Amino acid sequence: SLQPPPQQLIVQNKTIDLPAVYQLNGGEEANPHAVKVLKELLSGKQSSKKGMLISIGEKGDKSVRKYSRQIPDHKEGYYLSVNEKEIVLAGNDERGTYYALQTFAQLLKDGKLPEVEIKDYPSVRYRGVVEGFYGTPWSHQARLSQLKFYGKNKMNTYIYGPKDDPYHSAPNWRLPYPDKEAAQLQELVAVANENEVDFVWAIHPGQDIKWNKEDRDLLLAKFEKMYQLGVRSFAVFFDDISGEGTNPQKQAELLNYIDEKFAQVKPDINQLVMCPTEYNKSWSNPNGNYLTTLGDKLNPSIQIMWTGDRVISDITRDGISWINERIKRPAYIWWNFPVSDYVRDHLLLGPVYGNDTTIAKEMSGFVTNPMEHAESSKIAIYSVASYAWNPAKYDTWQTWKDAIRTILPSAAEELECFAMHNSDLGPNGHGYRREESMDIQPAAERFLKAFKEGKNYDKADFETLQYTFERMKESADILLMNTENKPLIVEITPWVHQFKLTAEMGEEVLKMVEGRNESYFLRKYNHVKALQQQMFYIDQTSNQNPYQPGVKTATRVIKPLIDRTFATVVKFFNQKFNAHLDATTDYMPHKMISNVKNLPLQVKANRVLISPANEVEIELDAIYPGENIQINFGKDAPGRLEISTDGKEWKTVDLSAGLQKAPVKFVRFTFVLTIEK
Numbered sequence: 001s002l003q004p005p006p007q008q009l010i011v012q013n014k015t016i017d018l019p020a021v022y023q024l025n026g027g028e029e030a031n032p033h034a035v036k037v038l039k040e041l042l043s044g045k046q047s048s049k050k051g052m053l054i055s056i057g058e059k060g061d062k063s064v065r066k067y068s069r070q071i072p073d074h075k076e077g078y079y080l081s082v083n084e085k086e087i088v089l090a091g092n093d094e095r096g097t098y099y100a101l102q103t104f105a106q107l108l109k110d111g112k113l114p115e116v117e118i119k120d121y122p123s124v125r126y127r128g129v130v131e132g133f134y135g136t137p138w139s140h141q142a143r144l145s146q147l148k149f150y151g152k153n154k155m156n157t158y159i160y161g162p163k164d165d166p167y168h169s170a171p172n173w174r175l176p177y178p179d180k181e182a183a184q185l186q187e188l189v190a191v192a193n194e195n196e197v198d199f200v201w202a203i204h205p206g207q208d209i210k211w212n213k214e215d216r217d218l219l220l221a222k223f224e225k226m227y228q229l230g231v232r233s234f235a236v237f238f239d240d241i242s243g244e245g246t247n248p249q250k251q252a253e254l255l256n257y258i259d260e261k262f263a264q265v266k267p268d269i270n271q272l273v274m275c276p277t278e279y280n281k282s283w284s285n286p287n288g289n290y291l292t293t294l295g296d297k298l299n300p301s302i303q304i305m306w307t308g309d310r311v312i313s314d315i316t317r318d319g320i321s322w323i324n325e326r327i328k329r330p331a332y333i334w335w336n337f338p339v340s341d342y343v344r345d346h347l348l349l350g351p352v353y354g355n356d357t358t359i360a361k362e363m364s365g366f367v368t369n370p371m372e373h374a375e376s377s378k379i380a381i382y383s384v385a386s387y388a389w390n391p392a393k394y395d396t397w398q399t400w401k402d403a404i405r406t407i408l409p410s411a412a413e414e415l416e417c418f419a420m421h422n423s424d425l426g427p428n429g430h431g432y433r434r435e436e437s438m439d440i441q442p443a444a445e446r447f448l449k450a451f452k453e454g455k456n457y458d459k460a461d462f463e464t465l466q467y468t469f470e471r472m473k474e475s476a477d478i479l480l481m482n483t484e485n486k487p488l489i490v491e492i493t494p495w496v497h498q499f500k501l502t503a504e505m506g507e508e509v510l511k512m513v514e515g516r517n518e519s520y521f522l523r524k525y526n527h528v529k530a531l532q533q534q535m536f537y538i539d540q541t542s543n544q545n546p547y548q549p550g551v552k553t554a555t556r557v558i559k560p561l562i563d564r565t566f567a568t569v570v571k572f573f574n575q576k577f578n579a580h581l582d583a584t585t586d587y588m589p590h591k592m593i594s595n596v597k598n599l600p601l602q603v604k605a606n607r608v609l610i611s612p613a614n615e616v617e618i619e620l621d622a623i624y625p626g627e628n629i630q631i632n633f634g635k636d637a638p639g640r641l642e643i644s645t646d647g648k649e650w651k652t653v654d655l656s657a658g659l660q661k662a663p664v665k666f667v668r669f670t671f672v673l674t675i676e677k
């Protein structure tokens, strides 16, 4: 499956052997990076002049002057041809030639090419990735892998802007990178150039920028240092700030100053891009005039970024129309997927979909803001590349499958399995959701409704569920030990562990359903409980970031199914045997029996908290030093806070409330406790 799919393709049923003897036409004049890919692919082959002609060059070269009528007249376009007589690789420009070779390399199979003619070019001028997230910035090694990936998928744009790089954002945006980091960025730029990617260095100065000479000069001096490191494209971001830095006239004046004194003075600056403060429609205040002020004042060559109708949204026709009218140019899309920096306990490994496929003329650019997990982001990045290049032929599902097969050929089916059940975000403040476990979600829902009602579940539904849990176990175990993409496996391992437990738990719960004696049922019940404890353990020891710590997997369909099935079948056992098995579905070492009630406790880092729900005594599992207690809202009944180690003698605590390291085991109140580790 050629990816991205070319604009125009005609294939003949005819194999052509990659020629034992070739004559290279235009090797000396075509894009050096293209030529280098070609020599690699023709290794162990006789170059001679008693050989099949290989014509490579850009439009204007002598080597390809025959084919000027065939070469699309678009930036980054190319003509490619293979037949028994000769091979032609002719870009409209140097990048076009490089892109002909990326398609060519995909056509090569066993040492044999199809007889084919291709005319190709992108529908969107700028295509790629913005490293624009909160969290651990991508490692240097990850970035070098990214750039190679982008070259292979004809993404021409990489915008460097990790929110948490102190030399990118406030206050050290003012400071040059130190030597080590600088040397690394120099390397990134060279590798980007070799892979035909524009390295766009962004700066994020808005939270503390002063609209004076001194800060304008420092910004320009920083840009100058980046230029000395090889950077030839630049961005200024004003996203997620408050204060004077949000002033549109000042932002526009700054960017036009950079444009006229820097970008237009240098011989060789490409992209100049800004991210507005109102970067989506929901954040745009119609009582003011912010967007129309940028649109009217910002020089027109400068790009203006946009995430859609909301912070996290997919791009529609009416949406891009709405923004474009206001900024008086086509928006450069900043698509906030698969970025997971607000749901950091989930991986987002599903297909890329929802963006209108007919609106390519209406965008200046399209870039994705990915997860801090670089390798795992390649599923979405690969797909965005395909979409951006040829949106008219964008095939959501096939592209996803092709991405996975590219990233992990040794275990693509195992990755598909893992990815299909790790795609939803779960509940979040943005309300953005993705499908998950779509394949099995009707059989899951029929089974559970029937089981609950005391009707006979369809056998086939039961078996689908069994198969699913089995496949999940196989996929988890295989993925853990795969050495083809070690950095991918490092990224996902905690979730792979949790995923395997989820599957084991599912199996044991199905045996509880099927179970036909008391003793066997009890063994399975005990096992489920222990598995819940293992999941808690992984949730408390992996991915312990400050915002959404821990590891959630298969959340949309499968964990609910298992939980509700367990709860239900425990209820039926208890009725049947007049027993009192606990039907809780998540392990909790602490207890909270209490008035006013059914809310689970959660542990997050060194906090113990009552689940907030939409419409009071905690006992911990030990004595710990207390830090504080914070409480909020949601309540009718007309309250008095205390603390204890034995739940006999109680110290009242005032009110937020500090605990001053006093020993705590019990908290009472007729909601979060922090304790010391």
Ligand SMILES: CCCCCN1[C@H](CC(=O)NC)[C@H](O)[C@H](O)[C@H]1CO
Pocket (backbone or CB within 6 Å): 132, 133, 134, 239, 240, 275, 279, 307, 311, 334, 336, 339, 341, 342, 369
């Ligand atoms: C309440 C506001 C949430 C911030 C949303 N954005 C940020 C800014 C942005 O969208 N820039 C265009 C970061 O880029 C981040 O990664 C992404 C998703 O959380």
Ligand SMILES: [Cl-]
Pocket (backbone or CB within 6 Å): 438, 439, 440, 441, 442, 443, 444, 464
């Ligand atoms: Cl189904």
